[PDB]
């Protein structure tokens, strides 16, 4: 399910909210990708250092 990468110092994971299938409010280590047109949060992105 995941996609990974790392840039600058960051280790980013990306979960499309589809395949999360169990959803929650998370603390601030979560960026939420927003569809340009429709404006939803369709994937949560996580960080690490």
């Amino acid at each position: 399910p995941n996609l990974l990468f790392s840039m600058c110092g960051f280790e980013v994971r990306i979960l499309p909210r589809q395949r999360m299938e169990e959803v929650v409010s998370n603390d601030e280590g979560v960026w939420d990708l927003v569809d340009e047109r429709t404006k939803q949060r369709t994937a949560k992105a996580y960080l690490k250092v």
Partner: protein, 72 residues
């Protein structure tokens, strides 16, 4: 007008999660009245539904729009 903005935001956030469809459900079971009379105040249905053209979502305002067409 404060409160106007306060709630205005509140939907321009909660929308941006639920995406205005799941919110179609949650409303459809909500029975929110002081917000949404179907039973009176066609004027206040212009204020409601207009106001949700102003927020911009206005796609959960439909049935009330029909009602606007109905009273007359």
């Amino acid at each position: 007008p404060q409160g106007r903005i306060f709630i205005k935001f509140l939907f321009q956030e909660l929308v941006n999660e639920l995406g205005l469809d799941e919110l179609q459900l949650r409303l459809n079971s909500s029975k929110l009245d002081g917000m949404f009379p179907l039973e009176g105040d066609a004027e206040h249905i212009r204020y409601s539904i207009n106001f949700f053209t102003a927020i911009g979502l206005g796609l959960l305002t439909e049935d009330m729009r029909s009602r606007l067409t109905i009273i007359q």
